[PDB]
Design a protein around this nucleic acid. Structure first.
Lengths: 102, 169, 292, 75, 159, 102
RNA sequence: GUCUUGGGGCCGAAACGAUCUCAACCUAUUCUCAAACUUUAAAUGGGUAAGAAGCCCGGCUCGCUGGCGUGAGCCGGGCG
RNA sequence: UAACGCAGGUGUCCUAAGGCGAGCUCAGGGAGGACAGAAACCUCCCGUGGAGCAGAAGGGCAAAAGCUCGCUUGAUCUUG
RNA sequence: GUCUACGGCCAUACCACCCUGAACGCGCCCGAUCUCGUCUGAUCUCGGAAGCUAAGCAGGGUCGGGCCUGGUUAGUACUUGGAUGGGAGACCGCCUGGGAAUACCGGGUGCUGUAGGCUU
């Protein structure tokens, strides 16, 4: 058309990553450390550039972390709900939660 | 309860949705006129749905709002056609109850060969003294929380007053 | 069920009205126009006649607004009328006129223009004129300040107005709302008004109940008969009052009592009485749940 | 015919090569735009100090002498 | 790219900050303006009459014409080489008084007060605000304690 | 044609997401962002493996389809078919334009 | 978590009584975004003010402004 | 503050859709009522703009700038 | 201590609830001759004082939702100015200076002007 007016029309869809963004994430038993660490490098080959691989300190997909997590579940501040855990703070009317359940 | 809580009929509203304007409606206003003695008003259309026979601002229905002593006697005749019998789905969750009657003559109207075949709709608004404070203009407010009408609080007043009962449905 | 209207987000996105309109007492559309001065009249105050009716009292005030709060030049409550010679009926139309007559007289007696600007004693069909001398006594003015803007011929607030103008104030108005104004002929009458202004309709009302039924009469006016006031003296009592208001418009501001620091509901609960008590209150309600 | 469009980047040198950035703030700014009703009066107040000799400053003359006599006693 | 217009790009300029919609609070109106004092122009979107043009949203001047509902202003808006003094007319409920000059008329009073109070000390207390001096050497007490030994932390790669 | 991902690798345009002002965008070649045993409670898998980017770049949604399969295709052979849990923590939003100029 | 639901159905009232079972919903949670979305919100940046064009008193003038105030303007006097 | 950058609109429309004043409050949702049903009309409740204001989009607004009424033509003449 | 009328700031003033009331001070309220508007004296308007704090309103409470102000997040993000600094490049470290926001964790829940009452 001679570039007399060249605004592209869409095709495909892309996603951006910043330095430190987390592309892909896997959950597994603690005995499968090696199965995770190398399956990801198997995945690493289908991506431009280079990505570091390390095993997180965060229990599961939760916001909360390594082996202090089992205390709070026992301490009754978190409760397991499906793929995640609800934080039970104290600003909520816990005198109407403890009255409901200790 | 105490003297400041006695339940009363704030108002009672009657209407006929005749469906199409012209003559059948302007006959219908007579039926209400024969009943309560107050000049009724015609309610036009809010929307136009052609699967009824209605047009925008076509005069569809005539309604009325009786009040006070006049209301209570109209309810006495109105309830009698239903022989003081109702159901537990006739009492709204906001403390109102209603019903209908299939023919106008059953209240005390006199049939005439010029009169058509009309029914009409009943609906009773309970209330307690102080419920006008939600309408005042100079200074307004809410109605309350323990002074409102629950679902049950409507039924137990109705049952004792007009002797009737409610058949579960 | 369907989504609740009041979410945690709904409150975040809220916008309270101005407080006085939230309680419903002040109209902030009829204040922008009935209060604000123009900017080339820099500090010349603008006076309003705040006339309010309550279930058992009539309030009249004259005010001019400031950048912080209002300024009240004078006020004449209607429940001081037992002082002057009238006892029964303060929400009467005539009672309002007794208020509007006093408010002017007390205000004018403050400012030294009491001896002048008197107007008619009792007839209301005309405006009342002024004189202006620069930096010297003359030509008072104000504007009517109705509350929730209800204004239909015969309204009680227009009892004060005819009182104000006859009192000595000059209020721009029109005799289009004095009761007795025929709604469809648009004529000055001043006679039906003269009865309304003097309470002669109430005196007719009790003469109306006399013929028909005393039993209904007792239910209505049980405290007219207490400290007996019969219809035949009704206009006579008021004629004394309008005379009475003139000689003694001044106010003396009866003195107040001495406080023993009373409180009957509960103390004003501050941070500590909140912080420590409620930190207990949990530790108390906590104790019940571990004991059962 | 086909050609290049502009660019604007010496706008700041020419800008400040000369050029004083003040409007010459001045006493006695002209009365152009004032309210005519207001201005008519201030034209009258001037008019009745610029007219005559006996009415106005005969009051000014007396008051000044008191200003003359009062201040001197202090020295 | 876009084009000329009276209000172009004033989507946020006149946007009534986003927890305040409704009638302008009435302490805007009783504020009396007078010839020769300093105002700062600020656009408001509830008024729509006499709004200052977008170029004047922030420039300050002094009011020379006080009318019933509005106050003419002398403002400094610059075309390329010429910082003009342009007269505009705005409604009162846009602009507000400036606290800049009042921070000066506050110190004018005190400086003349101190000087007149010091006509009996015989010395001249010092003029305005020598700039911030150096920090005026002193001691530091540290007896009984010891400073902490700071050191860098090791590298921990988070997710 | 091919349009190799060398062209759209850097991040050199303002975000241009699928909205009312950009119509005709296709659907991304990735659609299933979670796979494995999804119902697993948080008690189950406490070893969360991550993959983290290191270049401020763009990843084509073509790749995320094949990276998800490639890492999934291994874990299935290693752990089982309900022994892990995979979540792609990246979504393709920023549509990218093309122009045919022949 | 239970209302219209289904799909598989059971009974033959009828099964969102119950119970399997998915589901549109609601409830709290969670993954990721926005140049033409935004509660918050910098760095850099834009006007002003930094005294005699002032500070302060006494008096006079008006066809505008009105409680008696006036706002504008004129004179005069001490401190730059 | 630019490009044959982007997503759009205009060459019109109004005796009211201008000017006042008054009285109301919208969108949406729930529960109840003869025919009446998801979808007419009647009542109550919740309802910070989620509606509407001619149209493009942005801004603005709830005892309005929205809706309905009653009167009118400030859509007039002349200076800057 | 508090209320009434008119307000300034316009949520620390809101919202959900629950508890108690400091002359009818505000209201609930009893009626429709007259003024006045309605289909309806429910609203609006007008005339009163037989009752009533139950409701409005005020005060308090909720390990409340909200709201204001703090704290950690963080000297992180971001950035004015410099380099013949690294890196093929994406970008990044440094010097000079300026410097935020959620999650999360605490504290607070009206101040007050003029005029007028009450000591219940």
């Amino acid at each position: 058309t001679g570039m007399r007016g060249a605004f592209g029309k869409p095709q495909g869809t892309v996603a951006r990553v910043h330095i430190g963004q987390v592309i892909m994430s896997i959950r597994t038993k603690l005995q499968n450390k090696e199965h995770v660490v190398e399956a990801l490098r198997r995945a690493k080959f289908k991506f431009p550039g280079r990505q570091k691989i390390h095993i997180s300190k965060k229990w599961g997909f939760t916001k909360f972390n390594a082996d202090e997590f089992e205390d709070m579940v026992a301490e009754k501040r978190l409760i397991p709900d499906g793929c995640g855990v609800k934080y039970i703070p104290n600003r909520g009317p816990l005198d109407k939660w403890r009255a409901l359940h200790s | 309860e105490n003297p400041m809580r006695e339940l009363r009929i704030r108002k009672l509203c009657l209407n006929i949705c005749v469906g199409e304007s012209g003559d059948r409606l302007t006959r219908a206003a007579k039926v209400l006129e024969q009943l309560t003695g107050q000049t009724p008003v015609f309610s036009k259309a809010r929307y136009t749905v052609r699967s009824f026979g209605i047009r925008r601002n076509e005069k569809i229905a005539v309604h009325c709002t009786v009040r006070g002593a006049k209301a209570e006697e109209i309810l006495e005749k109105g309830l009698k056609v239903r022989e003081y019998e109702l159901r537990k789905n006739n009492f709204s969750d906001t403390g109102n109850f209603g019903f209908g009657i299939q023919e106008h003559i059953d209240l005390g109207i006199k049939y005439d060969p010029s009169i058509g075949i009309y029914g009409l709709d009943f609906y009773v608004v309970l209330g307690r003294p102080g419920f006008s404070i939600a309408d005042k203009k100079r200074r307004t407010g809410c109605i309350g929380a323990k002074h409102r009408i629950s679902k049950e609080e409507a039924m137990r007043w109705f049952q004792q007053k007009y002797d009737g009962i409610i058949l579960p449905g | 069920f369907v989504k609740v209207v009041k979410n945690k987000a709904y409150f975040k996105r809220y916008q309270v009205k101005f407080r006085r309109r939230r309680e419903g007492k002040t109209d902030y559309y009829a204040r922008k126009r009935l209060v604000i001065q123009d900017k080339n009249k820099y500090n010349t105050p603008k006076y309003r006649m705040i006339v309010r009716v309550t279930n058992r009292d009539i309030i009249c005030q004259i005010a001019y607004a400031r950048i912080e709060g209002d300024m009240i030049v004078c006020a004449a409550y209607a429940h001081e009328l037992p002082k002057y010679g009238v006892k029964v009926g303060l929400t009467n139309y005539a009672a309002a006129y007794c208020t509007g007559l006093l408010l002017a007289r007390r205000l004018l007696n403050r400012f030294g223009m009491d001896k002048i600007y008197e107007g008619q004693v009792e007839v209301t069909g005309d405006e009342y004129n002024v004189e202006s001398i620069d930096g010297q006594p003359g030509a008072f003015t104000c504007y009517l300040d109705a509350g929730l803007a209800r204004t239909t011929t015969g309204n009680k607030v227009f009892g004060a107005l005819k009182g104000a103008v006859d009192g000595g104030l000059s209020i721009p108005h029109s005799t289009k709302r004095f009761p007795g104004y025929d709604s469809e002929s648009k004529e000055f009458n001043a006679e039906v008004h003269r009865k309304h202004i003097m309470g002669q309709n109430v005196a007719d009302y009790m003469r109306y109940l006399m013929e028909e039924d005393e039993d209904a009469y007792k239910k209505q006016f049980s405290q007219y008969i207490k400290n007996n006031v019969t219809p035949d003296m009704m206009e006579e009592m008021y004629k004394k009052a309008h005379a009475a208001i003139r000689e003694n418009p001044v106010y003396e501001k009866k003195p107040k009592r001495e406080v023993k620091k009373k409180r009957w509901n509960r103390p004003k609960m501050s941070l500590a009485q909140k912080k420590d008590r409620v930190a207990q209150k949990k530790a108390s309600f906590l104790r019940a749940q571990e004991r059962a | 015919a086909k050609s290049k469009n502009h660019t604007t980047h010496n706008q700041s040198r020419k800008w400040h090569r000369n050029g004083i950035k003040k409007p010459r703030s001045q006493r006695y700014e002209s009365l152009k735009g004032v309210d005519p009703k207001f201005l008519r009066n201030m034209r009258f107040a001037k008019k009745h100090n610029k007219k005559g000799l006996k009415k106005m400053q005969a009051n000014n003359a007396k008051a000044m002498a008191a200003r003359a006599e009062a201040i001197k006693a202090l020295v | 790219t876009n084009t000329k217009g009276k209000r172009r790009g004033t989507r946020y300029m006149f946007s009534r900050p986003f927890r305040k919609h409704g009638v302008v609070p009435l302490a805007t109106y009783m504020r009396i303006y007078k010839k020769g004092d300093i105002v700062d122009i600020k656009g408001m979107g509830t008024v729509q009459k006499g709004m200052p043009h977008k170029c004047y949203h922030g420039k300050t001047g002094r009011v020379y014409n006080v009318t019933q509902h509005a106050v003419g202003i002398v403002v400094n808006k610059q075309v390329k080489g010429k910082i003009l003094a342009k007269r505009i007319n705005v409604r009162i409920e846009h602009i507000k008084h400036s606290k800049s000059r009042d921070s000066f008329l506050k110190r004018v009073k005190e400086n003349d007060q101190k000087k007149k109070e010091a006509k009996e000390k015989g010395t001249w207390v010092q003029l305005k605000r020598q700039p911030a001096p150096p920090r005026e050497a002193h001691f530091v007490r540290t007896n009984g304690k010891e400073p902490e030994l700071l050191e860098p932390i090791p590298y921990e790669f988070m997710a | 044609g091919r349009r190799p991902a060398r062209c759209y690798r850097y991040c050199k345009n303002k975000p241009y997401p699928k909205s009312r002002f950009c119509r005709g965008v296709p659907d991304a070649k990735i659609r299933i962002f979670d796979l494995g045993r999804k119902k697993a409670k948080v008690d189950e898998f406490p070893l969360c493996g991550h993959m983290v980017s290191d270049e401020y770049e763009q990843l084509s949604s073509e790749a995320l389809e094949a990276a998800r399969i490639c890492a999934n295709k291994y874990m299935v052979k290693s752990c089982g078919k309900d022994g892990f849990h995979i979540r792609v923590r990246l979504h393709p939003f920023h549509v990218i334009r093309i122009n045919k100029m022949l």
